[PDB]
């Protein structure tokens, strides 16, 4: 080898990578990509192969250091540990609920109110009940007889629609 050589006589360093896969457990993988953690939003989470959809909030459950996920009685993942920063996150399910329409007769009026059951009013004449969020009904401080039952002691009537 001289440095004055032409191409094809110059030295070439060659590395041959042979990826072989025997049925022993595989231990050579690529970089597992990670993205910034977003909390308090209904996101699709994928934590160490455990996937799902939920709202990831801060948790007061103190895990033991070998434990990663958390399950309730009904075997649903409600707590998890972030692998980047060892912190515990609660996985609340994303809000779902029945949509009910409260109306008088169409012979009387076409005005309606909408009840989103078990849904907070910030996640949808807006009133928060224990039955859910009621939109389109004016809440009054007076007490009358029950005309249209809403639930949890709340009733609706037509006089506009009041609750």
């Amino acid at each position: 080898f001289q440095p004055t050589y032409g191409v094809g006589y110059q030295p070439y360093r060659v590395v041959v990578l042979s990826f072989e896969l025997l049925h022993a457990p595989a231990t050579v993988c690529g970089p597992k990509k990670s993205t910034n953690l977003v909390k308090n939003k209904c996101v699709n989470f994928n934590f160490n192969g455990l996937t799902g959809t939920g709202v990831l909030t801060e948790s007061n459950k103190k895990f033991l250091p070998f434990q990663q996920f958390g399950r309730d009685i009904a075997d649903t993942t409600d707590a998890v540990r972030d692998p980047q920063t060892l912190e515990i996150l609660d996985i609340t399910p994303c809000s779902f609920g029945g949509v009910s329409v409260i109306t008088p007769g169409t012979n009387t009026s076409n005005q309606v109110a909408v009840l989103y059951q078990d849904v907070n009013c910030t996640e949808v004449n807006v009133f928060q009940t224990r039955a859910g969020c009621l939109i389109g009904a004016e809440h009054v401080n007076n007490s009358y007889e029950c005309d249209i039952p809403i639930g949890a002691g709340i009733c609706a009537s037509y006089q506009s629609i009041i609750a």
Binding site: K61, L64, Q67
Partner: protein, 254 residues
């Protein structure tokens, strides 16, 4: 280098009661204030656990089966028990697993060791004697890690081999009981998972001699065998398994 130990005293190995020992965490999932029924390879309650001694002249390094899994208990003072050997034929024909804890570090190697008939470490009164294997030709897995370790210390280990995965569970307990296994409950936390992917049917305990012939330091260990069964585990408010029920022991626990 291999050395036959020819000054042993003939004595049958002993047997004793497992009580409620050998329970390990079956998975990596946090559970709190719950009663969870799980079916896994567990050590049965109040079972016949085999007892081996090291006392002076007893030096118990026999050939034991591995079967589906091994519970290894150690009533230890002054650090005689140092590691384990796993394999099928324990020679260069098959591939064998070495776990050692010498005076510096913990070494795990998967090689085809030509093992001695009596593998051992030694302490001179300093460690200057190591006779475990005579050769090591084809090595696939190496892993150097942290040190895992009247009888003062209790060491519980659970060794399992499922789907090419070697699960080692460990628990360290301060005790002050003289001779036998203390009666109580302690759930074994997972120590390490090794992707060794080898067939294991036989295993060896590695001990250490004391030289000043040879003298065996006072130590005792216990070997039990795991069986597939159901336990009802109780998880407290802190996520720690505090009590267990063997589902097939007696009709009350059933």
């Amino acid at each position: 280098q291999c050395v036959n130990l020819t000054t042993r005293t003939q004595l049958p190995p002993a047997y004793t009661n497992s009580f409620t020992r050998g329970v390990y965490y079956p998975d990596k999932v946090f559970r709190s204030s719950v009663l969870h029924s799980t079916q896994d390879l567990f050590l049965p309650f109040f079972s016949n656990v085999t007892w081996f001694h090291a006392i002076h002249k007893r030096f118990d390094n026999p050939v034991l089966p591995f079967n589906d899994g091994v519970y290894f208990a150690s009533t230890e003072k002054s650090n005689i028990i140092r590691g384990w050997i796993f394999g099928t034929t324990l020679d260069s024909k098959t591939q064998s697993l070495l776990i050692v804890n010498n005076a510096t570090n913990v070494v795990i190697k998967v090689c085809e060791f030509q093992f001695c008939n009596d593998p051992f470490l030694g302490v001179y009164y300093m460690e200057s004697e190591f006779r475990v294997y005579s050769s090591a030709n084809n090595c696939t897995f190496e892993y150097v890690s942290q040190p895992f370790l009247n009888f003062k210390n209790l060491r519980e280990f659970v060794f399992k081999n499922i789907d090419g995965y070697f699960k080692i569970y460990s628990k360290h307990t301060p005790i002050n009981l003289v001779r036998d296994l203390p009666q109580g409950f302690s759930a074994l936390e997972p120590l390490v998972d090794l992707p060794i992917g080898i067939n294991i049917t036989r295993f060896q305990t590695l001990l250490a001699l004391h030289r000043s012939g040879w003298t065996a330091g006072a130590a005792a260990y216990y070997v039990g065998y795991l069986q597939p069964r159901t336990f009802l585990l109780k998880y407290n408010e802190n996520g720690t398994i505090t009590d267990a029920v063997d589902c097939a022991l007696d009709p009350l626990s059933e």
